Design a protein around this ligand. Structure first.
Ligand SMILES: *[C@@H]1O[C@H](CO)[C@@H](O[C@@H]2O[C@H](CO)[C@@H](O[C@@H]3O[C@H](CO[C@H]4O[C@H](CO)[C@@H](O)[C@H](O)[C@@H]4O)[C@@H](O)[C@H](O[C@H]4O[C@H](CO)[C@@H](O)[C@H](O)[C@@H]4O)[C@@H]3O)[C@H](O)[C@H]2NC(C)=O)[C@H](O)[C@H]1NC(C)=O
Ligand SMILES: *[C@@H]1O[C@H](CO)[C@@H](O[C@@H]2O[C@H](CO)[C@@H](O[C@@H]3O[C@H](CO[C@H]4O[C@H](CO)[C@@H](O)[C@H](O)[C@@H]4O)[C@@H](O)[C@H](O[C@H]4O[C@H](CO)[C@@H](O)[C@H](O)[C@@H]4O)[C@@H]3O)[C@H](O)[C@H]2NC(C)=O)[C@H](O)[C@H]1NC(C)=O
Ligand SMILES: OC[C@H]1O[C@@H](O[C@H]2[C@H](O)[C@@H](O)[C@H](O)O[C@@H]2CO)[C@H](O)[C@@H](O)[C@H]1O
Ligand SMILES: OC[C@H]1O[C@@H](O[C@H]2[C@H](O)[C@@H](O)[C@H](O)O[C@@H]2CO)[C@H](O)[C@@H](O)[C@H]1O
Lengths: 262, 267
């Protein structure tokens, strides 16, 4: 029925390490800094954002605006009328990127420290550039079941696939709004590959560098993609006992198909 | 109207394995959608307004290595079972509207004679008629073998209405529901891999009752997503609410058409 009538939802935007996009000290004066801050339970306008039909993101009447079109400039709140029309404009992508269409200078957080001011940076698909519009501030804790019904399991620095003892040295994962997959018992540790090329180095290494390579997308076809390198999570040889999850290009075989079981 | 011949995917529960289950469902999925309309990465099914009756239904032939065979007619626009043929007989759920009742006329045109049930195949009706809820009816390969036999003997006369309705709930969940969601498909493959007979978890029940609701929510969403949280369940009966499409992308495989894209182009 009809062309799809699209809306304008009032949602929180959650991003690096779980922190919400925030208008500093709760003040709306033209030029105030948008920053990363702990997510709030309540309804203070400075952490709630309206995604408008015209592509502007608005906390309390004012637009999220970039200072200029250069790597490095900060993002600030600004009255939408006074502000340079396509600097108040942003697109929110299915793969977690809020871009400002003037090259691919992307909303980013370059430290995941509470209070960091948001900047726009060139798009390397990193954890500091993945955002989720959601009023759900806690990450999604899932079990990931993959080849031969075997579960993904981390045991301190490594990750491999083993059988699902539904209580075990864990194999429950927290999937964050920034695009990282973190081992549920140590949540400031990340599923990490020093990607670009390949192979096992899908390790568990701290989330702190927030690299591309620590950012991952669960796609419709069942693969877990590294957005940047373009390669998917792959069990080496289809052999569970080698205990290595490499990074490799999509062929489509079972050793690259995973499932979030909640 | 109809000449052509509808498409036929067959599965057999006889030496059923996780791969032949898996390839049965990709073959069903690839026969329901034409590839044209993907929105936020999930496939959308055809619109029933714009559809020739020859493009309308696909046929699934299921059998036992234990003898029998039955053919279920899936409707391409919502992936759901409209009826079946068993032997010389063809039985259909009771169409709930005038457009559909004309359509069903083109399904198993060779049969001796077609019979239309007094009830619908919506679970609500079927579960009242089985005297048992979907949570009390087990799923697994061994349940579908039984169901193909129950379906097959309603033509002759074993019949027995509770059991027919209980066999319908098993078929729709292991074919239509598994085609619609990669979550329910993998749930069914966990049962085949370990030879489990298991009633579905609260997770599975909620996804099924939310299929039409998630299809609207994703289609009228914005970019990112949505005007209202859809609430869902965990395997254990818990919590959560969904406000965005990204968690849904590895869990919904097909969506029913709700509205056209902003012109013929998007997502
Ligand atoms: C995530 O979390 C946030 C915060 O918890 C949720 O925020 C609430 O969002 C709801 C729905 O999106 C908001 O509700 C609506 O705001 C409307 C404002 O309207 C203007 O209306 C008059 C004319 O009617 C205009 O002249 C004037 O400019 C008003 O400001 C209200 O109209 C709605 O309510 C009341 O509507 C009816 C009919 O109008 C009234 O008669 C009744 O009085 C009724 O009570 C309604 O309030 C709500 O404001 C938001 N909370 C906040 C911030 O206050 C997000 O919705 C949620 N996100 C998601 C995606 O779930
Ligand atoms: C993360 O998520 C985003 C989601 O968008 C990805 O970004 C876009 O990636 C797409 C591929 O999905 C890029 O695609 C190409 O898009 C171009 C034009 O599409 C626009 O134009 C039409 C109408 O004219 C609009 O309806 C539509 O809405 C878009 O505005 C085309 O140039 C391409 O078409 C041609 O490609 C080749 C030619 O070399 C041939 O196949 C044909 O000639 C074909 O016509 C193709 O459609 C799109 O440009 C990306 N950018 C944006 C801003 O959308 C990210 O890529 C993804 N991240 C990762 C790592 O995957
Ligand atoms: O910037 C940090 C933090 O500030 C809160 O706002 C305070 C403000 O810092 C204080 O000077 C003023 O007296 O009252 C405000 C409300 O507590 C913001 O509310 C919070 O969102 C953060 O943004
Ligand atoms: O080397 C990673 C790559 O291996 C492919 O598989 C081969 C494997 O190399 C070898 O033991 C033998 O040739 O049989 C395996 C099965 O094909 C995998 O296909 C690929 O996914 C990667 O895992």
């Amino acid at each position: 029925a009809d062309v799809c009538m699209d809306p304008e939802p009032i949602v929180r935007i959650v991003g690096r390490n779980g922190l919400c996009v925030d208008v500093r000290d709760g003040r709306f004066h033209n030029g105030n800094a948008i920053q990363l801050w702990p997510c709030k339970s309540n309804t203070d306008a400075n952490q709630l954002w309206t995604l408008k039909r015209d592509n502007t993101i608005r906390s309390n009447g004012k637009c999220l605006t970039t200072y200029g079109y250069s790597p490095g400039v900060y993002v600030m709140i600004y009255d939408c009328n006074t502000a340079a029309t396509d600097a108040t404009r942003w697109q929110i992508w299915d793969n977690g990127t809020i871009i400002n269409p003037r090259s691919s200078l992307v909303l980013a957080a370059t430290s995941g420290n509470s209070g960091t001011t948001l900047t726009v940076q060139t798009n390397i698909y990193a954890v500091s550039q993945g955002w989720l519009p959601t009023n759900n501030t806690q990450p999604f804790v899932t079990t990931i079941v993959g080849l031969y019904g075997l579960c993904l399991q981390a045991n301190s620095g490594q990750v491999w696939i083993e059988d699902c003892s539904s209580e075990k040295a864990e194999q429950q994962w927290a999937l964050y709004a920034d695009g990282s997959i973190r081992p549920q018992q140590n949540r400031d540790n990340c599923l990490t590959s020093d990607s670009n090329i390949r192979e096992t180095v899908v390790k568990i290494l701290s989330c702190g560098p927030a690299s591309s390579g620590q950012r991952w997308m669960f796609k419709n076809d069942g693969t877990i993609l590294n957005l940047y390198s373009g390669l998917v999570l792959d069990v080496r040889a289809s052999d569970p006992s080698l205990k290595q999850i490499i990074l490799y290009p999509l062929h489509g075989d079972p050793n690259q198909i995973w499932l979030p079981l909640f | 109207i109809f000449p052509k011949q509808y498409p036929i995917i067959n599965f057999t529960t006889a030496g059923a394995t996780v791969q032949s289950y898996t390839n049965f469902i990709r073959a069903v999925r690839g026969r329901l959608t034409t590839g044209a309309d993907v929105r936020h990465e999930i496939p959308v099914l055809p619109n029933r307004v714009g559809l020739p009756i020859n493009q309308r239904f696909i046929l699934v032939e299921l059998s036992n290595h234990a003898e029998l065979s039955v053919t279920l007619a899936l409707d391409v626009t919502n992936a759901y079972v409209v009826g079946y043929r068993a032997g010389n007989s063809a039985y259909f759920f009771h169409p709930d509207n005038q457009e559909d009742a004309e359509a069903i006329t083109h399904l198993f045109t060779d049969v001796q004679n077609r019979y239309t049930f007094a009830f619908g195949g919506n679970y609500d009706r079927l579960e009242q008629l089985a005297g048992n809820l979907r949570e009390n009816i087990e799923l697994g390969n061994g349940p579908l073998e039984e169901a193909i036999s129950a379906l097959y003997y309603y033509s002759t006369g074993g019949t027995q209405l509770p059991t027919l309705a209980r066999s319908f709930i098993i078929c729709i969940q292991m074919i239509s529901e598994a085609a619609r969601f990669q979550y329910i498909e993998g749930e069914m493959r966990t049962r085949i891999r370990y030879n489990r007979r298991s009633a579905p978890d609260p997770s599975v029940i909620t996804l099924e009752n939310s299929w039409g609701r998630l299809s609207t929510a994703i289609q009228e969403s914005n970019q990112g997503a949505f005007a209202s949280p859809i609430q869902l369940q965990r395997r254990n009966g818990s919590k959560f609410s969904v406000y965005d499409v990204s968690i849904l992308i590895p869990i919904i495989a097909l969506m029913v058409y709700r509205c056209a894209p902003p012109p013929s182009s998007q997502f």
